[PDB]
Each structure stands twice: as C-alpha cells, then as structure tokens.
Amino acid sequence: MATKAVCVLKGDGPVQGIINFEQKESNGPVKVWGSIKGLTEGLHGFHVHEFGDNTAGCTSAGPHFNPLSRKHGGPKDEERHVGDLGNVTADKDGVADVSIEDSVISLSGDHCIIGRTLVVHEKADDLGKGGNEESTKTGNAGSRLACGVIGIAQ
C-alpha cells in the first residue's frame, strides 16, 4: 500500500534531520535517504525502534524493532533486528548524508515500519560484534540523540 514515508528527527539537543523512505515494489527493497545535522563527527547507530511513542521523548520508543526475535547485527548480516540500519557517518561539520538501500525493512506487511520510531544514537553501533551482552541487544550505540515517528508521505 504505502510506497513513500518520511521521518522528522528531533531531540533535546541540536541533532535534527529529515529521512525519506521509498519502496516502489511491495516485495522490493526500501531506499532510505536524507540528512541529519548537529552530530559529533564520526559514526552513529541508526535504528528503527518498536514504538512510535514519543510521550517520554526517545525513551518511550522502546527497543530495536525485532519481530523475528533475532540478535542485533549490522544491516548486511542475516542475523539482525528488522530495525538494524547500521551507522550513519557525520562529517567534520556534524552533517550525516544518509543513503541506504535495505531489503529487510518494508513500508507494508509484517516488517512494516510505518508508525514506528527512527532513532539516531550517541555512539557507533558495533554491529553486534563487540563481545558482550549489550552488543547483542543494542550494538553499544548508547544514548538516543533524536527520533521521530515514521509517517506515510505523498
């Protein structure tokens, strides 16, 4: 049904952004693109979380969206959360230019991410390869800097 979606990211700090999603075929991949500003230079975990609940800011978004009950990985791993979109990279000006294609998320059906929350994190996602409990759950990406509900777009 939905072929386009959009998310406005905001937080308590300076991190702000707009991410676009496009899926021209229901059984095809989703392109995810846009820009995030206000970030510290370097890598930042970038995940779809389960709830589109911003009533307590990014905290009420709950955990990584994981309907298949897998362990956390990078977006190229077979073992991954549906929500695991890896890292975005901020340049020296604090701007991350996002350009991702993904085959696991969907804008329709059981992996559908409309109505869930996109979150950019304080630290790099260790892609589930950090050798501890936390790595297998969250990637050690730490704090939530900005988030927004993924909405249907024209």
Place this chain on the structure above:
Amino acid sequence: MATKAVCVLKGDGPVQGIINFEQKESNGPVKVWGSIKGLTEGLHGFHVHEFGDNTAGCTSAGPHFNPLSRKHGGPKDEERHVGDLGNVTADKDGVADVSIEDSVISLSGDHCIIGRTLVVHEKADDLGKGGNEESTKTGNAGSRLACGVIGIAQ
C-alpha cells in the same frame, strides 16, 4: 496487528497534548482519549489527515484522510471522510478531555490511521452542514493548531 496507538500533538502556539487510541478487535471501534491544553473554550475540529509528514509543520499533513473520496461529514454520517472525527470541546481552562469512539477509523487494514497525522483545529467543524464549498472539504474548521504523527504504542 496493532491494538494501541498514540499521538503527541505539538504546534507553534500554546496547543499541545497526548491522544491515545485503542482497538481491541480489528472489526471493532477505536477508542480515542487523552488531553489537549491551550485551546480556546468550546468546539475544535479534530481530524486524521492523510500524510504523516511533519516536514513543514502541520501543513505537510495534507487533507483529511479520505481513501473513499467522500465529502466531509460528521463522524455519525455515512457520507464522511475516514479521518472525520468531528469536534473536541475545551473547557474554560483551555483543556479538552477527549473521549471519542469511532468505527470508521482503524488501526489496521484499508482505513488504518497509523503513520497518519492527527490535527486539532482553530474553529468548530460544522460537520459538513455549513452550505458552502469549504464545508464539504474541511467543515470550515480553519487553521491547524497542533498535530503529530500517529504511532504504534505498547
């Protein structure tokens, strides 16, 4: 299979609030309740708009959600937009304690309002009885005071 949703309404003015949605059965009504502050005493149009797109504030939400291409009505009318939830009423302190039950909106299927935008309006919705062109589109409810994307809730 969502059975709960939530929406944080924010705007450029004093209007803000949190609205909850619950739909225990997919063939059943959706209960809509919560609290919005900052509103002038009396009736305010309360609608689901088509896009969950807050890139230009409430303007980018587009028109009332209307997948059946009907004219604007009140929620008790057969001729209504899916998104036509009617009015909410703010008391003398500016508070609307919202409590609605509606069987045309849904949290799944064709009429699913997850990922769409809830908007509270400046003026009363005339429920399509205003006799002018605008009544059949917006109910003459006027500008958008606060809005948010409807998200899946726990």
